[PDB]
């Protein structure tokens, strides 16, 4: 576990960070879109609903 | 009344089809021998006539279906059936397609 | 080219003129267009062969 | 026929699954037949790669080459490999672009890279060289379009380098393959060939936008002025396309 | 890995908006700025399809169906489970397709080859674009796009085809189909020509371009040549894609009536002696 | 902009190329007259080559004209030899197959009897042309790939008009010889037997038909992209590959993760083209004979989508609202 | 002593230290963001 | 920590700046659009509602 | 057993790690999507039901 | 000594130890995650 | 047999292991999916049924 | 007789693979035909006897 | 008695992968053949024996 730094001995930092950067934004959009799809967690609908 | 009164109370009057002329428009006659030197299924369809909706579909569809009580359904109600003589063919489908295109 | 392209250009101009010329005296756009297209093929080909 | 066997699996289902098995065999056959060139795989260091893919190399097929050029077996020992490439890796790992050590266009490494083809001219059915100057052609002449002979040649940067002396035609298929450029003494010497597919002919001048004026003096030459071998033919074509990326930094650098 | 000749061609440069930041290869694939956006858009669109499939209740690839909203919603955004997800996937699909074409520009720019392939793909993109965003705007409702299902989008073609009363009489469909059949005909003959010349009967020398050039001269009396077939074939396929775009863009917003009734101009002309 | 190799900017014309010839001695049956056309030369070879007057070709041409004429004179007899009506209804007239109440028996001439005679001559012409392709490849000492690719088209051609009607129990299952009528038959065939969208072999043929157009746009553009490296000379690139084959391969290796060779591309090109009528021929052959309703076949095999929304316009709008009143 | 990227242990240890520092900071904000949303609308 | 400046040792400042500039505007345009799609957060329609 | 380390003599660690990274996330996603398909384990709908 | 990837016998042994250590850490998180889900809503 | 080890003299270990790896997961996924299709062994509705 | 000369005509490698595919496809086809038949369907017959 | 000479004709590499996919497809086909049958369907029997 303490030797996890060796991942950079096999993966180029400027080649996996592009993959790492894309993957995070892919998630950040994915769950946000999933939440907006649900009726309970759609914060845009809730503001309209709370306004009566 | 199951048809004229289908959605609302909108009936049929003498003006509904005549529309101010003695002979109501869009009336049809029997022109089944459409083309010469032909008989059978070849004699009713291979031409663009008034009854065929600008197609080469049969022109006898109005006569056979709306006047002679011929069977309009052509589909088979099972995925695989024993195709026996007398069953509807693609010619009958083409004629039904001609009638229903007029609809 | 040059002469052939110009001769084709004369035909398409003639085809457009015949398209609207027959529309004025009646007919319809589609009926006039077919004569206009037919005129473009005929006089355009003849001009591209005889003039050039 | 109209009756089903073990469930809803009728003859249509049997034919469908029979095609599925045939298609899987066909894809294996089709994919393998494409492995006759460029395989086995390698890494950026030139060694054999640890991974060769899921498709094994096919059995050796033989082509009986014509005009007495021997036979040819595709899988194994590509003779077209170039030995001394003027490149070195920009990264210690794999998957990163190479940076040329010297002049990319002169060394022919990037888009300017050629392939070590045979050093003999391509032959037609008669055995004669396939591409010859129109001066040596028996009864050939320009039938349509603008004749570029005598028109000045304008480079990518607008410089006038010379006038077209002749076009190297393909008498076997009756089309123009090259234009001969007689370089002015300022911009070079001798004659050079430019492929027709890289040149644009206007009414008064003929222009190539891929190569600047200063790079014509370094265009690869031909040993003989009457025929071009496949090696020279590959070097000449590659050089012009290499200038689409190496004529100036603006082409290599990002456009936005 | 790399092919036996791939090392030289792997040089830096030839990027549109990206630089050396994205100028690297992942396996055989080339990543660029537009390969980054392709990966993001394709993964987002693919995941949202399966997210919609999960909410649809089935994961069967045949039965997965993400559909556009109702026509009552117009051009505005719909609820995600009521058609809004289809709009986002469409936005992701447009981004994935455009970036893929722009990435192909970066591929061919790095290799010094022509831009014919990204242009040819753009025609196929235009056929998809005219099906999902151009035709709906001309009708004022996003609900006219085809649903994103393996068999659902076949129902849309069937219903849209019969929504114009025997679509076979569509003049642009008539032109588009005969380009599709000719392209396959041209593909079969061209593929046969090269294979036959390169693969003669055993014990026979391989045939050069002259032998294959004269084969159709003896077969159909005219051979278009080695170079001619590729350019005519590309135009045959691009015309098929372009005329397919035309046949569907003129269906609703141009000819709302039946397609056989379009041919009434030919049947009813003054020249014909009625 | 850079010169795209779509239209040649200059073309040269020399002595006409007759052919290569060998001890098979194809010259006697080869025409001695050739012509040149500059209009077609902007996109391809400008030489109108000489026909090889083989006996398979002559028989195919003569019997093909017999089928063409027989259909034509029946069409001319449809409208009573009225040429203006014949021209007006040219896209609508046809030679209809026999009525279904005749079976495989020979029907009267006015009720499909001339259809059988025309079909028989068409069958001879089509087969003779295939034998011409096979013989021409044999006499040229070339591969028979043209003959085999053609034979795939014959498969669907034979299934549509010969194989299926024989084992369907009636000649009425054949396709009418008409411009619009065989479009009507195409639609009526799908309607009668459910929906050919749900025929897996129709779907498979569509997969290869789109793939065939897809490949030949891919191959057409890729070769034109490497034509600056002599990529149009595919045969020489097969025997001795240059940078044209390498760049074309690396374009698609860097794009979609895998590529082909300059020869392996045509094997891919050949098979999707060949598979388009082979799969379609199978689907038509077992349509009606085996499966009489394709949507119901889809329902029982669980690949027909189900819709939970209402099927009426009243459920989404109203008649007054649609009219704007 | 394999190094596919040509990075020494000292170079990788320094580079991994910053990456984990960023990873914890990115996850620390996510934990706070997730905590606020659970207070707003719990999903359990 | 404070050693985040090493990102420029592996990522080119010119390309990252351009990439984030496109990303930030596309992010800004997208979020402005989803606000407009929602009836409650469409500031253009709310002015019409308050106009009465 | 103790000799499982030899898999890296057969498989390149770089290509396996990206392969398993793609595989694990796809497996992580599809298991999550399978749960959301079921009405019993759809934690988004359960939260809505609990609020009532 | 068989080695398709060019790694030595000792190089693969050390790489596997860290990979297996990561595998157990990933599995340990998943095991704790499964228990929390089982308590929240069992599936057996 | 004690001489089954000779299969590796016939088959390349790299291709076999990749082929076996994908086959085993596809085998495992299919059998899991077959259970989910059956009413008796689908543990997702069984959890719902047990919870009543 | 002396039918061993068939291998002087046919390539043993080319004919054995064709025979192997033909033999299995024939065996599968004959087995599948019996399944379609009501009398010889051993799966349906076993259910009937139970 | 001397069937071993088949490998002098057939390539062992191609045959072993040939039966490797063939034998599995035998198992897949026969197992699904049983599943289609109402009698030899162990999944349906377990539901039936559950009662
Ligand atoms: C449902 C209740 C809340 C909600 C709950 C949560 C929760 C809970 C969380 C988020 C999280 C996030 N939410 Mg939210 N979120 C909601 C509504 C929104 C809305 C909105 C308009 O309504 C927005 C804009 C966001 C946006 C965000 C992002 C700030 C963040 C996820 C980061 C990511 O995906 O990409 C990040 C990935 C990247 C790699 C992007 C790369 C792009 C940049 C420009 C690259 C620059 C790199 C360059 C080299 C410079 C480097 C410099 C470095 C400093 C060294 N949320 C609703 C209202 N949201 C998650 C989060 O991560 O918080 C930290 C989080 O935990
Ligand atoms: C009842 C039905 C009517 C009918 C109604 C319609 C309707 C309705 C339509 C057509 C359209 C078409 N018809 Mg029609 N048509 C009928 C009968 C026929 C017949 C026949 C033999 O009977 C034929 C050959 C055709 C032929 C065709 C083509 C002209 C065209 C198909 C779409 C196309 O060109 O691509 C166009 C589509 C694209 C090129 C897709 C672009 C793909 C994108 C860019 C890439 C996809 C990437 C994707 C993500 C995959 C990646 C995943 C993996 C990673 C690889 N029709 C029947 C009678 N026809 C369709 C059309 O024209 O569309 C424009 C159309 O909408
Ligand atoms: C409402 C209409 C039905 C329909 C009904 C059918 C029917 C019916 C058929 C197809 C078939 C086809 N359909 Mg469909 N199809 C529909 C919708 C579509 C759509 C779409 C987008 O909607 C598409 C793309 C397709 C696509 C296709 C192709 C995949 C396929 C034919 C390939 C072909 O050319 O074979 C190539 C072969 C031929 C065209 C004939 C070969 C001709 C011979 C060899 C040449 C003789 C030449 C002749 C003598 C003239 C010579 C003159 C020269 C000038 C000298 N269909 C709908 C469902 N479809 C075919 C099929 O099923 O395939 C399995 C078919 O029979
Ligand atoms: C049903 C009840 C719970 C539920 C129960 C569970 C359970 C139980 C589990 C999960 C698991 C996970 N859940 Mg869940 N889960 C639920 C709802 C959610 C929600 C949500 C918004 O509702 C989210 C976001 C998640 C998300 C997750 C992830 C944390 C995790 C899946 C990892 C994986 O598949 O990919 C794997 C990822 C990869 C392999 C790729 C990683 C990509 C990185 C960026 C690659 C770069 C690496 C680079 C080289 C640097 C490496 C450095 C290292 C330090 C060496 N769950 C519901 C609420 N969830 C499963 C899990 O995996 O737990 C660990 C788990 O066991
Ligand atoms: C309800 C149970 C099903 C059944 C379910 C399966 C399943 C499931 C599988 C097989 C498999 C096979 N079955 Mg079984 N099998 C059944 C009935 C039979 C019968 C028969 C005449 O009834 C035969 C010939 C077979 C034969 C076979 C082979 C094709 C294969 C075993 C390996 C092999 O190839 O060895 C080669 C053969 C020899 C060299 C001799 C060994 C003889 C075989 C192994 C024994 C079967 C003989 C059988 C018991 C005869 C029964 C008659 C008794 C006299 C009453 N099964 C019953 C009907 N069988 C496996 C396979 O690979 O399929 C591709 C598989 O996955
Ligand atoms: C457009 C003109 C013709 C053509 C040309 C053409 N297509 C091309 C090209 C060219 C020249 C390429 O260079 C490019 C390529 O690289 O192919 C390998 C491509 C291509 N055309 C393709 C397919 C394709 N082409 C088709 C047809 C055609 N190809 C036309 C006839 C068809 C049809 C009509 O059936 C299809 C399906 C791909 C193989 C490829 C495009 C690859 C691509 O876009 O990759 C990026 C995207 C992904 C990896 C996935 C994106 C997923 C989305 C975000 C979500 C889903 C969106 C989709 C609308 C859902 C569909 C649901 C159901 C309807 C199935
Ligand atoms: C569940 C699983 C079950 C599996 C069941 C199927 C299993 C197997 C069947 C075998 C599959 C093998 C698939 C591999 C395909 C490779 C074939 C190939 O491509 O090899 C070519 C041979 O060419 C052909 O074979 C042409 C094909 C004929 C065309 C069909 C005719 C229409 C007929 C229409 C009828 C259609 C029927 C409906 C080599 O040629 P070449 O080397 O280039 O030239 C040499 C020179 O001598 C020229 O003479
Ligand atoms: C006497 C003239 C008459 C005849 C003949 C006639 N219709 Fe109608 N039809 C009506 C009337 C009146 C209505 C109005 C019912 C309403 O919608 O409430 C109507 C309505 C309809 C409706 C319902 C439309 C709606 O808005 O729901 C359909 C569909 C219909 N007709 C089809 C047909 C078809 C098909 C035929 C030929 C078989 C036909 N009609 C023949 C009089 C007729
Ligand atoms: C469905 C429409 C329909 C309705 C209802 C209807 N008719 Fe008719 N009528 C016809 C048709 C069809 C004909 C036949 C055409 C013909 O005889 O010219 C006809 C023929 C007639 C004729 C003969 C016209 C001529 O050519 O001399 C008269 C008179 C007539 N209608 C009177 C009436 C009257 C009066 C009413 C009002 C009660 C009425 N019809 C309503 C359909 C209808
Ligand atoms: C569909 O299903 C539903 C249920 C919807 C679903 O949601 C499924 C969700 C699923 C499956 C979740 C999958 C998510 C997973 C697995 C989470 C991965 C996330 C990870 C791992 C977080 C990495 C964070 C790393 C950072 C952010 C570092 C910061 C780096 C810093 C900032 C800079 C780096 C340092 C330098 C550049 C300097 C060094 C350089 C030199 C010294 C030169
Ligand atoms: C100035 O000109 C004059 C002179 C007037 C003139 O003529 C002009 C001619 C004019 C306008 C006719 C133009 C023809 C047109 C538009 C028809 C298009 C044709 C089309 C679309 C064909 C579709 C169907 C094709 C199939 C699918 C066939 C199947 C054939 C099968 C395979 C044959 C099988 C064989 C038999 C059934 C025989 C069996 C018997 C024996 C073996 C004995
Ligand atoms: Fe080609």
Residue numbers in the entry:
A (entry chain E), H (entry chain D), I (entry chain F), K (entry chain G): 1 to 52
B (entry chain C): 156 to 258
C (entry chain O): 8 to 59
D (entry chain H): 1 to 256
E (entry chain L): 2 to 275
F (entry chain M): 2 to 326
G (entry chain e), J (entry chain f): 6 to 49
L (entry chain J): 2 to 51
Sentences from the paper on this structure:
The reaction center‐light harvesting 1 (RC‐LH1) complex converts solar energy into electrical energy, driving the initiation of photosynthesis. The authors present a cryo‐electron microscopy structure of the RC‐LH1 isolated from a marine photoheterotrophic bacterium Dinoroseobacter shibae. Notably, a novel subunit with an N‐terminal “helix‐turn‐helix” motif embedded in the gap between the RC and the LH ring is identified.
By using cryogenic electron microscopy (cryo‐EM), we determined three structures of the DsRC‐LH1s purified in salt‐free, Mg2+‐containing, and EDTA‐2Na‐containing solutions with global resolutions of 2.7, 2.7, and 2.8 Å, respectively. When equal amounts of cell membranes were dissolved in solutions lacking salt, or containing Mg2+, Ca2+, or ethylenediaminetetraacetic acid disodium salt (EDTA‐2Na), and separated by sucrose density gradient centrifugation (SDGC), the DsRC‐LH1‐rich components formed deep reddish‐purple bands at similar locations in the gradient tubes, and their absorption spectra were similar. However, the negative staining analysis showed that the stabilities of the DsRC‐LH1 samples purified with different conditions were significantly different. In particular, the DsRC‐LH1 particles exhibited stable forms in Mg2+ and Ca2+ solutions, whereas most of the DsRC‐LH1 particles purified in salt‐free or EDTA‐2Na solutions were severely disrupted. When incubated at 50 °C, the DsRC‐LH1 samples in Mg2+ and Ca2+ solutions showed higher thermal stability and the relative intensity of LH1 Qy absorption at 867 nm decreased slightly within 90 min. This is consistent with the observation that the DsRC‐LH1 samples purified using Ca2+‐ or Mg2+‐containing solutions showed no significant changes in the absorption spectra compared to DsRC‐LH1 samples purified using salt‐free or EDTA‐2Na solutions.
